[PDB]
C-alpha cells in the first residue's frame, strides 16, 4: 500500500496531441492496381546507379505494362574491359521493347507490384 506514483513511464519525449491519426487512411491509399502509369525518370535514373555496382552484360525483361520498356547494361563488346572505366555515355548498351499485353483487352492488377511502391512501412506526419 503506497501513495507514491513511482517511476512509472519514466523519462521520455513528449507526445503530439495536435497530430491526427491518418495511418489507417494511409493504409487504404497505400495500395494501387490496374495502373498503366509508366516508371518515373527519377526511378529509372536511380536504377542506373542501383545496378551500377553490379552492372553486367545481360538481357532483362521490359518491366513495363503499357510503356516503351528499356534496359541498360554494359555493352558485350566492352564486357572484357573493366566496368569501372565504363559509363552510361561511354559504353553502356541499352534497348527498347514495348509490352505485348498492352492490348487494353484484359485488366492487369498491379497489387503484386504494390510492395515496390511501399517501403514496408509508413511514417507519421509532424506539423
Coordinates of N, CA and C in Angstrom, one line a residue:
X1 N 0.9 -1.2 0.0 CA 0.0 0.0 0.0 C 0.9 1.2 0.0
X2 N 1.0 1.8 -1.2 CA 1.9 3.0 -1.3 C 1.1 4.2 -2.0
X3 N 1.3 5.4 -1.6 CA 0.6 6.6 -2.2 C 1.5 7.3 -3.2
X4 N 2.7 6.7 -3.6 CA 3.6 7.3 -4.5 C 3.4 6.8 -5.9
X5 N 3.4 7.7 -6.9 CA 3.2 7.4 -8.3 C 4.3 6.4 -8.7
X6 N 5.6 6.7 -8.3 CA 6.7 5.9 -8.7 C 7.3 6.3 -10.0
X7 N 8.3 5.6 -10.5 CA 9.0 5.9 -11.7 C 8.0 5.9 -12.9
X8 N 7.0 5.0 -12.9 CA 6.0 4.9 -13.9 C 6.7 4.8 -15.3
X9 N 6.2 5.6 -16.2 CA 6.7 5.7 -17.6 C 8.2 6.1 -17.6
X10 N 8.5 7.0 -16.7 CA 9.9 7.5 -16.6 C 10.2 8.6 -17.7
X11 N 11.5 9.0 -17.8 CA 11.9 10.0 -18.8 C 11.5 9.5 -20.2
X12 N 10.9 10.4 -21.0 CA 10.5 10.1 -22.3 C 10.2 11.4 -23.1
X13 N 10.2 11.4 -24.4 CA 9.9 12.5 -25.2 C 8.4 12.8 -25.2
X14 N 8.0 14.1 -25.3 CA 6.5 14.4 -25.3 C 5.8 14.0 -26.5
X15 N 4.5 13.8 -26.4 CA 3.6 13.3 -27.5 C 3.2 14.5 -28.3
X16 N 2.4 14.2 -29.4 CA 1.9 15.3 -30.2 C 0.3 15.2 -30.3
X17 N -0.4 15.8 -29.4 CA -1.9 15.8 -29.5 C -2.5 16.4 -30.7
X18 N -1.8 17.4 -31.2 CA -2.2 18.2 -32.4 C -2.2 17.2 -33.7
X19 N -1.2 16.3 -33.7 CA -1.1 15.4 -34.8 C -2.3 14.4 -34.8
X20 N -2.9 14.2 -36.0 CA -4.0 13.3 -36.1 C -3.6 12.0 -36.6
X21 N -4.4 10.9 -36.3 CA -4.1 9.6 -36.7 C -4.6 9.3 -38.1
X22 N -3.8 9.5 -39.1 CA -4.2 9.2 -40.5 C -3.5 7.9 -41.1
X23 N -2.9 7.1 -40.2 CA -2.2 5.9 -40.6 C -3.2 4.9 -41.2
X24 N -4.4 4.8 -40.6 CA -5.4 3.9 -41.2 C -5.8 4.3 -42.6
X25 N -6.0 5.7 -42.8 CA -6.4 6.2 -44.1 C -5.3 6.0 -45.1
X26 N -4.0 6.1 -44.6 CA -2.9 6.0 -45.5 C -2.8 4.5 -46.0
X27 N -3.1 3.6 -45.1 CA -3.0 2.2 -45.4 C -4.0 1.9 -46.6
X28 N -5.2 2.5 -46.6 CA -6.2 2.3 -47.6 C -5.6 2.8 -49.0
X29 N -4.9 3.9 -48.9 CA -4.4 4.6 -50.1 C -3.0 4.0 -50.4
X30 N -2.4 3.2 -49.5 CA -1.1 2.6 -49.7 C -1.1 1.4 -50.7
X31 N -2.2 1.2 -51.4 CA -2.3 0.1 -52.4 C -2.9 0.6 -53.7
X32 N -2.2 0.3 -54.8 CA -2.7 0.7 -56.1 C -2.7 -0.5 -57.1
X33 N -3.6 -0.5 -58.0 CA -3.7 -1.6 -59.0 C -4.3 -1.1 -60.3
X34 N -4.3 -2.0 -61.3 CA -4.9 -1.6 -62.6 C -4.4 -0.3 -63.1
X35 N -3.1 0.0 -62.9 CA -2.5 1.3 -63.3 C -1.5 1.0 -64.5
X36 N -1.7 1.8 -65.6 CA -0.8 1.8 -66.7 C 0.3 2.9 -66.7
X37 N 0.5 3.5 -65.6 CA 1.5 4.6 -65.5 C 2.9 4.0 -65.7
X38 N 3.6 4.7 -66.6 CA 5.0 4.3 -66.9 C 5.9 4.7 -65.7
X39 N 7.1 4.1 -65.6 CA 8.1 4.4 -64.5 C 8.6 5.8 -64.6
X40 N 8.9 6.4 -63.5 CA 9.4 7.8 -63.5 C 10.9 7.8 -63.8
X41 N 11.3 9.0 -64.4 CA 12.7 9.2 -64.7 C 13.6 9.1 -63.5
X42 N 13.1 9.6 -62.4 CA 13.8 9.5 -61.1 C 14.1 8.0 -60.7
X43 N 13.0 7.2 -60.9 CA 13.1 5.8 -60.6 C 14.0 5.1 -61.7
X44 N 13.9 5.5 -62.9 CA 14.7 4.9 -64.0 C 16.2 5.3 -63.8
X45 N 16.4 6.6 -63.6 CA 17.8 7.1 -63.4 C 18.5 6.5 -62.2
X46 N 17.7 6.3 -61.1 CA 18.3 5.8 -59.9 C 18.7 4.3 -60.1
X47 N 17.9 3.6 -61.0 CA 18.2 2.2 -61.3 C 19.6 2.1 -61.9
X48 N 19.9 3.1 -62.8 CA 21.3 3.0 -63.4 C 22.3 3.0 -62.3
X49 N 22.2 3.8 -61.3 CA 23.1 3.8 -60.2 C 22.9 2.6 -59.3
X50 N 21.7 2.1 -59.1 CA 21.4 1.0 -58.3 C 22.1 -0.3 -58.8
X51 N 22.0 -0.5 -60.1 CA 22.6 -1.7 -60.7 C 24.1 -1.4 -61.2
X52 N 24.5 -0.1 -61.0 CA 25.8 0.3 -61.4 C 26.9 -0.6 -60.7
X53 N 26.7 -0.8 -59.5 CA 27.6 -1.6 -58.7 C 27.7 -3.0 -59.2
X54 N 26.6 -3.5 -59.6 CA 26.5 -4.9 -60.1 C 26.2 -5.0 -61.6
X55 N 26.6 -3.9 -62.4 CA 26.3 -3.9 -63.8 C 27.1 -5.0 -64.5
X56 N 26.4 -5.6 -65.5 CA 27.0 -6.7 -66.3 C 26.2 -6.9 -67.5
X57 N 26.7 -7.7 -68.4 CA 26.0 -8.0 -69.7 C 24.9 -9.0 -69.5
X58 N 23.7 -8.6 -69.7 CA 22.5 -9.5 -69.6 C 21.2 -8.8 -70.1
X59 N 20.4 -9.6 -70.7 CA 19.1 -9.1 -71.2 C 18.0 -9.3 -70.2
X60 N 17.5 -8.1 -69.7 CA 16.5 -8.1 -68.6 C 15.1 -7.9 -69.2
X61 N 14.0 -8.3 -68.6 CA 12.6 -8.1 -69.1 C 12.3 -6.6 -69.3
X62 N 11.3 -6.4 -70.1 CA 10.9 -5.0 -70.4 C 10.5 -4.3 -69.1
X63 N 9.8 -5.0 -68.2 CA 9.4 -4.4 -66.9 C 8.4 -3.2 -67.0
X64 N 7.6 -3.3 -68.1 CA 6.6 -2.3 -68.3 C 5.2 -2.9 -68.6
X65 N 4.1 -2.1 -68.3 CA 2.8 -2.6 -68.5 C 2.1 -2.1 -69.8
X66 N 2.6 -0.9 -70.2 CA 2.0 -0.2 -71.4 C 2.9 0.9 -71.9
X67 N 4.2 0.9 -71.5 CA 5.1 1.9 -72.0 C 6.4 1.3 -72.5
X68 N 7.1 2.0 -73.4 CA 8.3 1.5 -74.0 C 9.3 1.1 -73.0
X69 N 9.4 -0.2 -72.8 CA 10.4 -0.7 -71.8 C 11.8 -0.5 -72.3
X70 N 12.7 -0.3 -71.3 CA 14.1 0.0 -71.7 C 15.0 -0.6 -70.6
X71 N 16.1 -1.3 -71.0 CA 17.0 -1.9 -70.1 C 18.4 -1.5 -70.6
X72 N 19.2 -1.0 -69.6 CA 20.6 -0.5 -69.9 C 21.6 -1.4 -69.1
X73 N 22.5 -1.9 -69.9 CA 23.6 -2.8 -69.4 C 24.9 -2.6 -70.1
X74 N 26.0 -3.1 -69.6 CA 27.3 -2.9 -70.2 C 27.2 -3.6 -71.6
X75 N 27.8 -2.9 -72.6 CA 27.8 -3.4 -74.0 C 28.7 -4.7 -74.0
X76 N 28.3 -5.8 -74.7 CA 29.1 -7.0 -74.8 C 30.5 -6.8 -75.3
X77 N 30.6 -5.8 -76.2 CA 31.9 -5.5 -76.8 C 32.9 -5.0 -75.7
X78 N 32.3 -4.2 -74.8 CA 33.1 -3.6 -73.7 C 33.1 -4.4 -72.4
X79 N 32.5 -5.6 -72.5 CA 32.4 -6.5 -71.3 C 33.7 -6.9 -70.8
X80 N 34.7 -7.2 -71.8 CA 36.0 -7.6 -71.4 C 36.8 -6.5 -70.7
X81 N 36.4 -5.2 -71.1 CA 37.1 -4.1 -70.4 C 36.6 -3.9 -69.0
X82 N 37.4 -3.3 -68.1 CA 37.0 -3.1 -66.7 C 35.7 -2.2 -66.6
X83 N 34.8 -2.6 -65.7 CA 33.5 -1.9 -65.6 C 33.6 -0.5 -65.1
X84 N 34.7 -0.3 -64.2 CA 34.9 1.0 -63.6 C 35.1 2.1 -64.6
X85 N 35.8 1.8 -65.7 CA 36.0 2.8 -66.8 C 34.8 3.0 -67.7
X86 N 33.8 2.1 -67.6 CA 32.6 2.2 -68.4 C 31.6 3.1 -67.8
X87 N 31.0 3.9 -68.7 CA 30.0 4.9 -68.2 C 28.7 4.8 -69.1
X88 N 27.7 5.4 -68.6 CA 26.4 5.5 -69.4 C 26.6 6.0 -70.8
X89 N 27.3 7.2 -70.9 CA 27.5 7.8 -72.1 C 28.7 7.3 -72.9
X90 N 29.5 6.4 -72.2 CA 30.7 5.9 -72.8 C 30.6 4.5 -73.4
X91 N 30.1 3.5 -72.7 CA 30.0 2.1 -73.2 C 28.7 1.3 -72.8
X92 N 27.8 2.0 -72.1 CA 26.6 1.3 -71.7 C 25.7 1.1 -72.9
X93 N 25.2 -0.2 -73.1 CA 24.4 -0.5 -74.2 C 22.9 -0.7 -73.7
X94 N 22.0 -0.2 -74.4 CA 20.6 -0.3 -74.0 C 19.7 -0.6 -75.1
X95 N 18.4 -1.1 -74.8 CA 17.5 -1.5 -75.9 C 16.1 -1.1 -75.5
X96 N 15.2 -1.0 -76.5 CA 13.8 -0.7 -76.2 C 12.9 -1.9 -76.6
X97 N 11.8 -2.0 -75.8 CA 10.8 -3.1 -76.0 C 9.5 -2.7 -75.4
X98 N 8.4 -2.8 -76.2 CA 7.1 -2.5 -75.7 C 6.3 -3.7 -75.3
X99 N 5.5 -3.6 -74.3 CA 4.7 -4.7 -73.7 C 3.7 -5.2 -74.7
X100 N 3.7 -6.5 -75.0 CA 2.8 -7.1 -75.9 C 1.4 -7.2 -75.3
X101 N 1.3 -7.3 -74.0 CA 0.0 -7.4 -73.3 C -0.7 -6.1 -73.1
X102 N -0.2 -5.0 -73.8 CA -0.8 -3.7 -73.7 C -1.9 -3.5 -74.8
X103 N -2.7 -4.6 -75.0 CA -3.8 -4.5 -76.0 C -5.0 -3.9 -75.4
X104 N -5.0 -3.6 -74.1 CA -6.2 -2.9 -73.4 C -7.4 -3.8 -73.6
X105 N -7.3 -5.1 -73.5 CA -8.4 -6.0 -73.6 C -8.6 -6.8 -72.3
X106 N -7.6 -6.9 -71.5 CA -7.6 -7.6 -70.2 C -7.0 -6.8 -69.2
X107 N -7.6 -6.6 -68.0 CA -7.1 -5.8 -66.9 C -5.9 -6.5 -66.3
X108 N -4.9 -5.7 -65.9 CA -3.7 -6.3 -65.3 C -3.5 -5.6 -63.9
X109 N -3.9 -6.3 -62.8 CA -3.7 -5.7 -61.5 C -2.3 -5.6 -61.1
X110 N -1.9 -4.5 -60.5 CA -0.5 -4.3 -60.0 C -0.4 -4.4 -58.5
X111 N -1.3 -5.1 -57.9 CA -1.3 -5.3 -56.4 C 0.0 -6.0 -56.0
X112 N 0.4 -7.0 -56.9 CA 1.6 -7.8 -56.6 C 2.8 -6.9 -56.7
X113 N 2.7 -5.8 -57.4 CA 3.8 -4.8 -57.5 C 3.7 -3.7 -56.5
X114 N 2.7 -3.7 -55.7 CA 2.5 -2.7 -54.7 C 3.7 -2.6 -53.7
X115 N 4.2 -3.8 -53.3 CA 5.3 -3.9 -52.4 C 6.4 -2.9 -52.8
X116 N 6.6 -2.8 -54.1 CA 7.7 -1.9 -54.6 C 7.4 -0.4 -54.2
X117 N 6.1 -0.1 -54.3 CA 5.7 1.3 -54.1 C 5.8 1.6 -52.6
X118 N 5.5 0.7 -51.7 CA 5.6 0.8 -50.3 C 7.0 0.4 -49.8
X119 N 7.5 1.2 -48.8 CA 8.8 0.9 -48.2 C 8.7 -0.1 -47.0
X120 N 7.6 -0.9 -47.0 CA 7.4 -1.9 -46.0 C 7.0 -1.3 -44.7
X121 N 6.5 0.0 -44.7 CA 6.1 0.7 -43.5 C 5.5 2.0 -43.9
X122 N 5.3 2.9 -42.8 CA 4.7 4.2 -43.0 C 5.2 5.2 -41.9
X123 N 5.5 6.4 -42.3 CA 6.0 7.4 -41.4 C 4.9 8.4 -41.1
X124 N 4.7 8.7 -39.8 CA 3.7 9.7 -39.3 C 4.0 11.1 -39.8
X125 N 3.0 12.0 -39.7 CA 3.2 13.4 -40.1 C 3.4 14.3 -38.9
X126 N 4.4 15.1 -38.9 CA 4.7 16.0 -37.8 C 4.6 17.5 -38.3
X127 N 3.7 18.2 -37.7 CA 3.5 19.7 -38.1 C 3.1 19.8 -39.5

